[PDB]
Structures are given as C-alpha cells and as structure tokens.
Amino acid sequence: DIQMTQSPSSLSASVGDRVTITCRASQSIHSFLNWYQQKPGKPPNLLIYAASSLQSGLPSRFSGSGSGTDFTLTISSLQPEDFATYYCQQSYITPPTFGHGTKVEI
C-alpha cells in the first residue's frame, strides 16, 4: 500500500492565523486524497474529498490543494471550533491508509 506522512505532527496557532498541513505519499495517488477532522473523543468528520472538494455544509474556510504526491489542507481563519486532529487518507489503492495525523494547539 501507500505510506502517508503528515507534517507537522503538531501545530501551534492562534485565532485568525493561517494553518497549512501537508500530506505526502510514498507513491503517486493522483487526486484521491481526503481530509478528515476529529475532535478528541468524537467520531471523525469528513472535510475534503478528491483533495479539492469541500463536503457539503461545512464552513468554506477549509481548502485543499495538491496532485500526485504532495497535498495541502489550508485553514484560512482558525476559529475556536477548528482545533482538532486532521487526517489525510488515500483512496487510490485499497487499503486506504490514514496519515498519522496533525494536532492543532494554541
């Protein structure tokens, strides 16, 4: 399968800052990366699918960008409800491997 490296493992940011989380794949996965958000002790929530498409109903501040091996999730305005762990998952080759996750601190 494809190994996923998510960087940074932990990020310190304040309200209204810019957040950028980079997911890198050992093998090209084209545009088949999805981004999930998980607050502590809660089920993960889908944020991005196809590496650029925002799941319907979620705040528009989130964005995605990437192709092939390097992908990026951008939070323009980090609101108090945006402090959670973000995972990147590849659907190009089953098994779908999740990145080890990036936690956003204060």
Added chain:
Amino acid sequence: TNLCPFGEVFNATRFASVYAWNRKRISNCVADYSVLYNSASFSTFKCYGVSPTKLNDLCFTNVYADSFVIRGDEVRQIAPGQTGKIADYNYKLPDDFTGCVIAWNSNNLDSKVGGNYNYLYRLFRKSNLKPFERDISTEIYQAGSTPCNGVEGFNCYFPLQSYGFQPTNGVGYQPYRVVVLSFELLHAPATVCG
C-alpha cells in the same frame, strides 16, 4: 483554389473523446489561416514554432488536425513540455512542437442538463504516452500487485472515466473543444499553402 476542409474539422457536430482523439490529415488543398485566427470566437489560439501571422504563407507538406474535447482547466496541458493526466495519459505534444493549438468553449451543444457522459478521459496508464500516441485500449489498470485477470475489482480500475458535463459547471469544468494543428515538412513537395 480548393479551400482546405477546416470547416468540418471546426464545425464537426460530434467531437471525439480525448483518449480517442481524431486525426484528420490535410493535404493537396489551399488553407487560409485567416478565417481561423480572426474568427473572434476562439478562447485559445496559441501557435508554437511558427508565428500565426506568418504561417499564412509558409508552405507545408502535411497538416494534421487533431480534434478532441477536454475541460477548460485542462487546455493548458495541450502544450509542449506539460505534465498532467491529459498530457501524460491521453494526448502528448512534442517538446519541439511546430504547430498551433485552438480551443473554444462548448457549454452549448455539449452540456446536456442530465449530463453528457459520452466523453471519456484516461485516468491511468502504465507509462506516459510518447508524443502523438493514441491509446484506445480498455484493459483493466492493475494498481496493486495482484493480477486482475480482466475483472474490475479492488486495485483493478477501468482506465477511462466520463467527464461530468453539466450546464452549471464552472468555466474550469465546462467542455472545451480543442483542435491541434501540426504543420510538418518532409522531403515531399509542399502541398499545403495559402
């Protein structure tokens, strides 16, 4: 004296898919690249190697018109030295290209409300296409290490995927018809002029 058949190439009612791009050779006719430039309807008209205003007198042995349909955001990939799912797997132009690329919007006549899925583009291939290569094979793509044995399953995908064309898509996703003219010289006499 015999106007080249550029009309039917640019007036075709049914364009080919990018993976089966249709190549029409043009020879033994006089081509006027004057209605083609000043048409005032072409979103993209970019000539590589030969200037658009000066090719109206350059005489060529053959002129290949390669027609297909792609998305708006993918027009930039029809150009020398471009990397992308269309440049790599569907239609590749040589780095030393000596022709022109024309493209125009087609939400009209090609964006049925229910969705026009007649157009397919290749998602996967074992290796990138060499310049001017046409791959119409529908063999299952083996992403994993397990041989597929010709059945669609996990890690075994159909290479061709249909373009999602809707009358509401953004300009980036709207259908663009593309015609690539390749003006070639050889030892044969120049049968294409204007």
Added chain:
Amino acid sequence: VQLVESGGGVVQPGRSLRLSCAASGFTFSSYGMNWVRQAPGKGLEWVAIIWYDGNNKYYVDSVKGRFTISRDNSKNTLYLQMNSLRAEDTAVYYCARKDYSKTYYGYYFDYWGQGTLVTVSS
C-alpha cells in the same frame, strides 16, 4: 443518517467477539461499508471494507485471516467477527459509510458512527 455500534467490551486474548453496526436514515443495500479502528492515543487505522454487492471484501494486514466483515442487508446491520484477538487490537471501532461513488479508487467515509471500545488484554 445514524450508524450506532455495539458489541464491544473486554475480551480475553485469543477469544472472539462480534461488533455490530445498525444503520438508519438511508438505504442500506446501496452503500459500501467500512470498519476503521483507532487505538488509544494513536491515529486512525482502516480495518476492513465490504462492498455493496455483498461479495467483495477487503482486509488490512494483521487483520486478514482473523476478522470477517459481513452485512445483513435485510436487517440493516453490518458485522465484524473478530476472531483470535491479539493484544494489539485494543481500539475504538467505527463503522464508516462509503460514498455513493460506484468506483473503487475515489471513495471517502462521509458518515461515521460513534465508536465501540474493544479492550483485549486479560
């Protein structure tokens, strides 16, 4: 759309368990289903997938040969028969829905459950 899990608990090493996931709010026999586990203080780990046709099932390494993913489309339930459990399968297991995509290469987990804890150490 709700996916409620059950069947987790404390199980002795080497024994077996069966996790269940009841789904409501959507047609069951149109969506592929997934089991994804999260060990305490670790990231998500995909466990298994069952396709909407009831024939195509895929498993992750260290889970293959032990766990059996199945579905009873007539009861709107998704099962995971965890046999020969080890000490490394301590985790919260989520039943995740797979998008209405019909394609094997672009799927995402749109709707998750709540998670059931399966402790294995004796």
